[PDB]
Amino acid sequence: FTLTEVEGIGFLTADKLWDDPRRLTAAAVYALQLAGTQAGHSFLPRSRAEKGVVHYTRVTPGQARLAVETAVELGRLSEDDSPLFAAATGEGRIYLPHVLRAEKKLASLIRTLLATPPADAGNDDWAVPKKARKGLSEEQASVLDQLAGHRLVVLTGGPGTGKSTTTKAVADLAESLGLEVGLCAPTGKAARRLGEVTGRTASTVHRLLGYGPQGFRHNHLEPAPYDLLIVDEVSMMGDALMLSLLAAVPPGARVLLVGDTDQLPPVDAGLPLLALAQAAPTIKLTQVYRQAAKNPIIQAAHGLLHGEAPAWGDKRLNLTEIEPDGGARRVALMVRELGGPGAVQVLTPMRKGPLGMDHLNYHLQALFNPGEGGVRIAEGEARPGDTVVQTKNDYNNEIFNGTLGMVLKAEGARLTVDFDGNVVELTGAELFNLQLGYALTVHRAQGSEWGTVLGVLHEAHMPMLSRNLVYTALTRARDRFFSAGSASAWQIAAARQREARNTALLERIRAHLEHHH
C-alpha cells in the first residue's frame, strides 16, 4: 500500500491486488489524492477526508477516523487548524504533505514579492514616458504605472479587452529601459501567440524554466535570467507551477501575470490567479474594443457571466439540435459543410461517452481520412494524414504534453509522426500516450484559438456543464462558433457556477503581510 505515493502506481491497483491499518491509512492518503484530481482541492476538512475513506473503501466511520488520524501521525497526511486570516468552523484541514508545503511556500513567495520594491542595490530606471502610453486607455496604461515600484503586478481581462496591446507596451517600455524581458505561457500555442502579438520570442513556462527529466533548471538557486517575466494565460496555472515560476524570479526583478479569471480553473490544485488578483496590484480591464463589441461570440461569452445561455441563430453563433447517442456522424458532416478539418476545430467537454472525443474522432477520421490498417493507439487507429495529440510528456523525444503531430506513416506497429518539425518514430508503450486529434476536448483546447469552432454540448456531458467550461469553449473562437447538441445544455451550463475549490493561499498571503510587522 506504500505504492500509493510513488508516481505511477497507486492505491487503485494496490487495493484490488491486496481491512488492515496499512490499507486504511493509505485510503486516507487516497481520499485526498482524489480530492485534488476530481475537484482540484488543496485540502479537505477532517470530516470530508473521513467521508472519502468511507466512500472509497467502505469501512466504518471510526475506522475512517482512525485511518485519517493514523495518516496524520505518520506524516503521510498533514493536519492544519492554524487561524489564518479569517480563522471558527470547529474543524481542521488535511492536506497531502507536499501540497500544504507548496501552498505555504507560494504564499510566502507572494508576500516577499509584494512587500519588496524592484531593483538590481536599490535602483530605479523604470520611467513612464507619454510615448510609452501611446494608444493605451486609462486602465492599460496604469499597468505601466503599477509596474513602477511593484515587483508583482496582475493584468486581468476578458477577450474584448486589449491585453495583447498592453502586454506589448510593457515589453517595449522595459527593453527601452535596458531590461531583459522574458515571455511566457503554459501551452505552446499560447506561447507562440504571445511572441506574435509582442513581436518577440516567447516560450512555454516549462521551457523558460529549463525543464527536463531532472526537473526545473531555474529556481531560487539559479533564477531565470530575466529582469521582467511576462506570463500569459495564468488561469491555467495551479499552485505547483506558480511556485516553480515565482521561485525562479531573480531577486528585485519583476513579474507581470496576465489572465482571464472566468476561464476554467487549473487542472492541478489551487486558484493562484484568483488569489493574486485579490492580493497583488491588479489591473482589471473592463473596456471591450469596438470591433470586439460587435462580435456575437464575445457577447455570448459575457452573457454566460450573467448566467445567460447564448442567443443563437447568427451566421457566427448558431446551434443545430442533435441527438448525442448517434449524433457524431452528423458533426462530421457539419465539419465537411464548413470545408473540413482545415477550416474548423471540433471541441467537446469530455473524452468518453456520446459526442465525447473518442466518439467524434472515429467519425471525423472515417469521413475525412477513410482507410484501413493503421497503427493502433490509445483508442482507435492512426493512419498517414491523421492529426495526433501527445497526452503525456515524452522525455526521450522531448515532446510535451499536448503537442499536436501529423502522422506521415504507420507501418507494422510503428508510427512516424511530425510534431512541429520534430519527425519522430514511435512504438510500444509510447503509442498508448497518443490520441487522434480531429476532435479536441475543451480542457486540451485551453490557450488555443481558431477562426471557427464547432462546440458539442448536451445533457450527455452533464457533469462537465459549468459556466467556466462553456466560457472557455466559446473564447476558443475568434470568428465563428457553431454548436451541436441541445440549447438547454447551454442553459444548464450558464446557470451552474462550478464548485468551490478548497484553497488557503489567499488566506495565507493576507496572514503574511496584513497582520505582520
Contact 107, 511 (CB under 8 A): yes
Q: Is 390 annotated as a binding residue?
A: no
Which helix (H) or strand (E) segment holds residue 70: the answer is helix 61-74
C-alpha cell at 416: 512516424
Burial 430-457 (b: 16+ CB within 10 A, else e): bbebbbbbbbbbbbbbbbbbbebbbbbb
| Structure determined by | X-ray
Q: Are strands 387-390 and 404-411 parallel, antiparallel or unpaired?
A: antiparallel
Residue 197 CA: distances (Å) to CA of 93, 280, 479: 43, 25, 18
Query: Could you tell me if 481 and 365 are in contact, meaning their C-beta atoms sit under 8 angstroms apart?
Result: no
| DSSP one-letter code for 255 | E
Does 476 appear as a known binding residue?
A: yes
The secondary element (H helix, E strand) that includes residue 443 is helix 442-445
> Cell numbers of 53, please?
475513506
> Does the annotation list 164 as a binding residue?
yes
CB 383 within 8 A of CB 407: yes
Place of cell 531555474: 218
78 is in an annotated binding site: no
Single-letter code of the amino acid located at 140: Q
Angle at 499 between CA 439 and CA 269, to 5 degrees: 75
Query: Radius of gyration of the chain from Cα atoms?
Result: 24
**Any binding-site annotation on 290?**
yes
- Name the burial class of residue 516, with classes exposed (0-12), middle (13-18) and buried (19+) by CB atoms within 10 angstroms of its CB: exposed
Euclidean distance between CA atoms 280 and 150, whole angstroms: 9
Dist. CA 155–CA 270, nearest whole Å: 19
Beta bridge partners of 346: 439, 454
HEC letters along 300-365 = HHHHHHCCCCCCCCECCEEEEECCCCCCHHHHHHHHHHCCCHHHCEEEECCCCCCCCHHHHHHHHH
SS3 164: helix
* Cβ neighbours around 336 below 10 Å, total: 15
Give the separation between CA 166 and CA 282, rounded to whole angstroms: 13
- The 3-state DSSP class for residue 254 equals strand
Handedness of CA 22, 26, 28, 31 (dihedral sign): negative
Coil vs helix vs strand at 260: coil
Phi then psi for 260, rounded to 5 degrees?
A: -115, 105
* Contacts of residue 90, Cβ cutoff 8 Å, sequence gap at least 6: none
- For residues 247 and 219, the answer to whether their CB atoms sit within 8 Å is yes
Buried b (16+ CB within 10 A) or exposed e, 476-501: bbeebbbbbbbeebbebbbebebeeb
Residue-wise over 87-108: b if at least 16 C-beta within 10 A, else e?
A: eeeeebbbbbbebbebbbebbe
- Say if residue 263 carries a ligand binding annotation: yes
512: its cell numbers:
503574511
Residue recorded with cell 489564518: 84
* Domains identified in the chain and CATH numbers: 1-95 (1.10.10.2220), 96-289+500-517 (3.40.50.300), 290-368+438-499 (3.40.50.300), 369-437 (2.30.30.940)
DSSP single-letter state for residue 353: S
Distance CA 417, CA 426 (A): 8
How far is 343 from 194, CA to CA, in rounded Å? 23
Kindly report the three-state secondary structure assignment for every residue of 77-130. Answer: CEEECCCCCCCCCCCCEEECHHHHHHHHHHHHHHHHHHHCCCCCCCCCCCCCCC
Q: Quick one: cell of 310?
A: 447564448
Assigned C-alpha cell, 139? 486602465
| Angle at 164 (CA atoms; ends 161, 168), nearest 5 degrees | 135
174 sits in the region (left: phi over 0; alpha: psi -120 to 50; else beta) called: alpha
Alpha-carbon gap, residue 443 to 499, rounded angstroms:
16
Q: Is 146 annotated as a binding residue?
A: no
User: Does residue 133 contact residue 169 with C-beta atoms inside 8 Å?
Assistant: yes
Q: Report the 10 Å Cβ neighbour count for 33.
A: 20
Q: Do 235 and 187 form a contact (C-beta atoms < 8 A)?
A: no
Name the residue type at position 205: V
How many other β-carbons are positioned within 10 Å of the β-carbon of residue 222? 12
3-state secondary structure of 389: strand
Q: Determine the Cα–Cα distance for residues 262 and 158; give it in Å rounded to an integer.
A: 8
Please give the distance of CA 189 from its chain centroid, rounded to a whole number.
13
* Short-list 474, 487, 499, CA closest to 303: 474
Which of these, 457, 454, 458, lies nearest to 479 by C-alpha position? 454
Q: Work out the burial of residue 200: count CB atoms within 10 Å of its CB; fewer than 13 is exposed, 13-18 middle, 19 or more buried.
A: middle
